[PDB]
Design an enzyme around this catalytic site. Structure first.
Site, PDB file in Angstrom:
ATOM      1  N   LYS A 178     -18.498   0.686  -0.372  1.00 50.45           N
ATOM      2  CA  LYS A 178     -18.209  -0.609  -0.978  1.00 50.45           C
ATOM      3  C   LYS A 178     -19.102  -1.636  -0.328  1.00 50.45           C
ATOM      4  O   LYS A 178     -19.189  -1.693   0.874  1.00 50.45           O
ATOM      5  CB  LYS A 178     -16.717  -0.983  -0.802  1.00 50.45           C
ATOM      6  CG  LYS A 178     -16.329  -2.352  -1.370  1.00 50.45           C
ATOM      7  CD  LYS A 178     -14.840  -2.495  -1.330  1.00 50.45           C
ATOM      8  CE  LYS A 178     -14.291  -2.404   0.104  1.00 50.45           C
ATOM      9  NZ  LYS A 178     -14.396  -3.728   0.768  1.00 50.45           N
ATOM     10  N   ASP A 235      -0.188  -4.685  -0.605  1.00 51.08           N
ATOM     11  CA  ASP A 235      -0.657  -4.528  -2.005  1.00 51.08           C
ATOM     12  C   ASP A 235      -0.691  -3.068  -2.450  1.00 51.08           C
ATOM     13  O   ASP A 235      -1.730  -2.548  -2.952  1.00 51.08           O
ATOM     14  CB  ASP A 235      -2.030  -5.214  -2.207  1.00 51.08           C
ATOM     15  CG  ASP A 235      -2.289  -5.645  -3.678  1.00 51.08           C
ATOM     16  OD1 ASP A 235      -1.346  -5.710  -4.486  1.00 51.08           O
ATOM     17  OD2 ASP A 235      -3.457  -6.000  -3.995  1.00 51.08           O
TER      18      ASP A 235
END
Ligand SMILES: Cc1ccc(O)c(C)c1-c1cc(-c2ccncc2)cc(C(N)=O)c1N
Length: 276
Positions: free
Chosen positions: A58, A151
């Site tokens: 990423k 999350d």
């Protein structure tokens, strides 16, 4: 001129030549596909020149805007390093910064649970039980490290071999003060977080809604009466069509609105239905 790539770590470069103009990422990896792109940047499937193996990388989208922006972005690595190695958590291999861009290289996983659901309707429940069990193992691990994921959701759980899955996206981990954090998805939010309260129970609640969602293949409400009616300690029949009695009972343990009463990950893992 550009500074050399610097490793990012909060603990304490082969085939790569600093004399050549190209980035550490351009030099050291073969880009195979793009797995995702968003506000945050992009995720690529790569093969490493160092060891020949596949990984995911990423990279952030634009250079750091100032020292606090940098510090906040780098903090994802410190959180991820706190998770360390666990078979149900996405493993970070290394992280670095170059050109004001942050790179995280992790093990390569399969599709997220969100993606898996989108490309399957409703999953066979045997699969669902495995995802529930593996992500409960992940949460037991997080809690043992004094960490809470704020999350947990289908997009942040990634498939692995033979029904296995791994929790990821650890930039939204908080410590048991808490540390700076972003907003979790309201669909999966434990009710106590409305009052800023959190603890080990909160991600058990989010995992409950996560599994409900993928088991019933229906969109959960982001607010309003429907949001409230999933936080009362029962399952609205809207969501339970075709769910087994066994799965329903375990989800209702996870969805208890009072976090003092809600099942812990270890208590859930100790149920006969979740053996092995
Ligand atoms: C690279 C990375 C760094 C830290 C992190 O916490 C995670 C989850 C990742 C990661 C992210 C994704 C992904 C796919 C589409 N959209 C958003 C994210 C896919 C994988 C993957 N399939 O291997 C992956 N390991």
């Amino acid at each position: 001129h550009q500074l050399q790539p610097r490793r990012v770590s909060f603990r304490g470069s082969p085939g790569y030549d600093p004399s050549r103009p190209e980035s550490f990422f351009q030099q050291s990896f073969q880009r195979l596909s793009r797995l995702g792109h968003g506000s945050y940047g992009e995720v690529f499937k790569v093969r490493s020149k160092e060891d020949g193996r596949l990984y995911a990388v990423k990279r952030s989208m634009s250079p750091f805007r100032g020292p606090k922006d940098r510090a906040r972005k780098l903090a994802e690595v410190g959180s991820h390093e706190k998770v360390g190695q666990h078979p149900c958590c996405v493993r970070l291999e290394q992280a670095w910064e170059e050109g004001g861009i942050l790179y995280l290289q992790t093990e390569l996983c399969g599709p997220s649970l969100q993606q898996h659901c989108e490309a399957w309707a409703s999953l066979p429940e045997a699969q669902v039980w495995g995802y529930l069990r593996d992500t409960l193992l992940a949460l037991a691990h997080l809690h043992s490290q004094g960490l809470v994921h704020l999350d947990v959701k289908p997009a942040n759980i990634f498939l692995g071999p033979r029904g296995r899955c791994k929790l990821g996206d650890f930039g939204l981990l908080v410590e048991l003060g808490a540390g700076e954090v972003q907003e979790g998805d309201p669909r999966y939010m434990a009710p106590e977080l409305l009052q800023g309260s959190y603890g080990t129970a909160a991600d058990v609640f989010s995992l409950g809604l996560t599994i409900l969602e993928v088991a019933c293949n229906m969109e959960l409400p982001h607010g309003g009466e429907g949001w409230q009616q999933l936080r009362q300690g029962y399952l609205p029949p809207e969501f339970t069509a075709g769910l087994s009695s066994e799965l329903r009972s375990v989800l209702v343990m996870m969805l208890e609105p009072d976090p003092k009463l809600r099942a812990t990950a270890e208590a859930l893992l100790a149920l006969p239905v979740l053996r092995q």
